[PDB]
Amino acid sequence: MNSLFASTARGLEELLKTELENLGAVECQVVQGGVHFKGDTRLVYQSLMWSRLASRIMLPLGECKVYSDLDLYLGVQAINWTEMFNPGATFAVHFSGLNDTIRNSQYGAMKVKDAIVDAFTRKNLPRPNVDRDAPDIRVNVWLHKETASIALDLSGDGLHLRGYRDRAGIAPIKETLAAAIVMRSGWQPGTPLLDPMCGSGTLLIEAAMLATDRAPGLHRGRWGFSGWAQHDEAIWQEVKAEAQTRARKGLAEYSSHFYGSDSDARVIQRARTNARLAGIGELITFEVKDVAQLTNPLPKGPYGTVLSNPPYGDSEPALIALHSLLGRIMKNQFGGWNLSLFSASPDLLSCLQLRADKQYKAKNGPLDCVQKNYHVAEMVAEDYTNRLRKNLKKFEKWARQEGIECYRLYDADLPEYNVAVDRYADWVVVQEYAPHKARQRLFDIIAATISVLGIAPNKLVLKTREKGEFLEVTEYNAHLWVNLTDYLDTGLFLDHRIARRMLGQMSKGKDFLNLFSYTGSATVHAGLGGARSTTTVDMSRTYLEWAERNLRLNGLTGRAHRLIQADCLAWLREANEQFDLIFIDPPTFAFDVQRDHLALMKDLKRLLRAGGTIMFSNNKRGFRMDLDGLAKLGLKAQEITQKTLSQDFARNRQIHNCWLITAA
C-alpha cells in the first residue's frame, strides 16, 4: 500500500478526490492544495496516466523537524539516495516554504542539494549532476511550520502538459482548470459541445479527450519515474497498453461532435494543430467566425451545451454588446441548450439576461473568476428603452428639420436612469451622473442605448463618475472641433446653440467680444456672420488654443481675430476698446454671478459702443436679474431665455437663462 500526494489548484481538491477515488484510490484526505491517497503500485501508475485534475503526483519519502541546518541535512540523508538514483540520473530539488532556519527558499534547495550529493561523495560514488531543465529525478520539499516534507515527483513535468501543445507556454487556461471547467459545465458527454470564442481550443480538446476516454498521459513524452530505481516498467507497460486500448475504442465509438470558432484566424489555426496533436482532431470543427454570426449547427436537435471563456478587458461598450448579443443569440437559436461560461466579469455575464442556476468560484492565476451555468428555454429596462425610442423619433426628425448634428437624446428623463445620452454626428456619448447592482444597471443602460440607436459599440463613449482623437462636427453653418473622451466636457455646450445662432445673425460689420469664451464656439458663429472683428478671452491657454483651432477651421484667421489669455474680471476693469456685440457667459462661481452681475454690467457699459447689445448668460438655478439696478445704470434687460431654449433641453428643469442688455 503506497502513500501518494497529488497537488492541485485551490478550489479543485474535492473534484480531485472524486477522480482519484474513481480510478481506484483508497483513503483519500483532502488538504489545502492537494489530496493524500493510497493504493498499490499499479494504482500509482494508473493515477499518473489518468488524472486530469492533478498538477503533480508525488511519492512522499519522509519528513523531519527543521530547527538548525543540521536537522535538515540529517533529515535529508535518512533517505537512501545512492540506491534510488539509476546510474547517470540527473536531479533537481524544488523547495518551497520558509521558517526561522531556512529563511530563503533557494537556500532551502541548496542545502538539500548538498545533503544528497554528500550521500554519494561519502560512498566514494560519483556526484550526480543537477539538471534544472529536465532532471530524471525531481525532488520536492515543502517546509510548513517546523516540519519539512520530502517527496519524489513522479509527474516530472507538470501534468497539465498532455502533449498536445507546448512546454512554453502560458495558456490563459491550464489544461487542468479547463478539465474542471468542463466537468462543472453540466455538459453531457455524447452531446454536441460548442464554443464560439474558443481561442486555442483547450476547453474543447479537454472535453473530447474526457468524452472519448483518452487519458491525459497518453501523449506525454516524459515522466518523473524513469530515473528512479523502484520504477516498475512491467506495470507501467500495462497501464500504457490499457490506455491505448481505451483510447482507440472511445475515439472509434464517439458519435457526437465538437464546434469551435473565433474571430482570430491565428488562434483558430493553433486550435486546429492542437486538437490534431491530441489525437482527437477528427471530432472537432474549427472555423474563423464572429460571435455576431453564430448559428446553431444542429437546428433540428439534439440539444447540447455551449461552453466558453469570453473576454473581459475602455472596450466596455464593445464587451457589453458582445455579451448582450450572445444572450440574444442563445435565446434565438439555442433554445433547449445548456450554457456554461467562465469569466473574470460577472457584470459582463449579467448582460446575457439569463438567470444562472449553478455557479463556481475559481482562481486563474491572480484573477478571480466564476463559472455560471444557464438553461436556455424551449426585456431590459423597458422603462428607459421606451423613452429613448421615442425621444429618438422626435429628436431625429427635429434635428434634420433644423439642420443640426449634435444634440441630447436623453437627459435624465427617468430619475431611475440617471444618465445623459449625446449624439455628435456618427458618435454617441453617455455620461453617468450620480446613483455591482449599479454597474449592471449601467451595463443595461449601455446595452439598451446601443440597441435602440442601432449604432455600433465602437462609436459609443462612456464618461462616468470617478490619447485624443478630435472630431469635426457642424452646428448649423459652423464647423467645430470636439473631443469626446479627454475632458470634463466635449468642447461644446449643446444647449446654448440658439444663442450662438443668434450671435451669428446679429454680427455683420460688428466688433464682437466673447468673454469666458471656453472653446470659442460663439466666436465662430459671430465670425461667420460677418463680424468685422472678434476678440475672445479666457483664462485657459488650452481652451484658447482650441478656440483658435475652431476659428482656423472656419477660415477665420489674421489681425481681425484676437485671442487673449486673462482673468476676464481684470481684463474688464482695464480694457479700453469698444465693441458692438458682447457675448458674456460666466461661471456661476472672487466672482459670484448673482451678487456680482450688476458690477459686471457696470464695467461692460464702458466697453459697449453706442447702439450695441450685450448678451448675458448664466446657469445659476433661481438667478434673479436685478432689473432695478440696471435701470439705475441706464441699461435695459430683455429676457430671451425661452426664445433660446432648444427642444432637446426643454423638459430639463435645469436652466441657462439668457438676456439682451442694451441702453435706456
Domain with CATH 3.30.750.80 in the chain: 381-465
**Residues 533, 125: Cα–Cα separation, whole Å:** 100
The experimental resolution of this structure, in angstroms, equals 2.6
DSSP codes, 198-249: -TT-HHHHHHHHHHTT--TTTT----SSTTBTT--HHHHHHHHHHHHHHHHH
Residue 287, CA distances (Å) to 171, 199, 268, 635 in order = 20, 11, 7, 76
- Please name the fold of domain 169-211+256-380: Rossmann fold (3.40.50)
Phi, psi of 244 (to 5 degrees): -55, -45
Antiparallel, parallel or unpaired: β 470-475 and 460-463: unpaired
CB atoms near residue 261 (< 10 Å): 22
Three cell numbers, residue 537: 478671452
With CA atoms as reference, report the closest residue to 536 among 526, 613, 502.
526
CA end-to-end span of the chain: 110
Is the domain spanning 466-664 CATH 3.20.20.80? The answer is no
DSSP state, 432?
Answer: E
**Residues 448, 470: Cα–Cα separation, whole Å:** 26
Q: Indicate which technique resolved this structure.
A: X-ray
DSSP state, 625?
Answer: -
The owner of cell 494543430 is 273
Q: What torsion, rounded to 10 degrees, do the Cα atoms 151, 157, 160, 163 define?
A: -150
**Residues 327, 320: Cα–Cα separation, whole Å:** 11
Q: What share of the chain is helix, strand, coil (3-state, %, to 5)?
A: 35, 25, 40
Helix (H) or strand (E) holding 460: strand 460-463
Helix (H) or strand (E) holding 331: helix 316-333
The gap from C-alpha 621 to its chain's centroid, in whole angstroms, comes to 40
DSSP codes, 280-318: -GGGEEEEE--GGG---S-TT----EEEE-------HHH
**Residues 507, 215: Cα–Cα separation, whole Å:** 84
**Residues 105, 356: Cα–Cα separation, whole Å:** 44
The answer to whether residues 635 and 661 touch, using CB atoms and an 8 Å cutoff, is yes
DSSP state, 587?
Answer: -
Domain with CATH 3.40.50.150 in the chain: 169-211+256-380, 466-664
**Residues 300, 556: Cα–Cα separation, whole Å:** 67
**Residues 178, 160: Cα–Cα separation, whole Å:** 10
Domain with CATH 3.30.2130.30 in the chain: 1-168+212-255
Task: Indicate the class that CATH gives domain 381-465.
Answer: alpha beta
SS3 307: strand
Residues linked to residue 5 through DSSP beta bridges, in sequence order: 36, 58
The answer to whether residues 508 and 621 touch, using CB atoms and an 8 Å cutoff, is no
Three cell numbers, residue 48: 499518473
SS3 360: strand
Residue 79 CB partners (closer than 8 Å, separation 6+): 61, 62, 150
After which residues does the chain break, using C–N > 2.5 Å? 313, 378, 435, 466, 589
With CA atoms as reference, report the closest residue to 316 among 176, 480, 234, 432.
432
The answer to whether residues 646 and 498 touch, using CB atoms and an 8 Å cutoff, is yes
Is the domain spanning 1-168+212-255 CATH 3.30.2130.30? The answer is yes
In terms of DSSP H, where are the helices of 424-467? 437-453
Residues linked to residue 307 through DSSP beta bridges, in sequence order: 340
Three cell numbers, residue 486: 479627454
**Residues 581, 660: Cα–Cα separation, whole Å:** 10
**Residues 461, 529: Cα–Cα separation, whole Å:** 33
Q: What torsion, rounded to 10 degrees, do the Cα atoms 179, 184, 185, 187 define?
A: 80
Angle value at C-alpha 42, between 37 and 47, nearest 5 degrees: 50
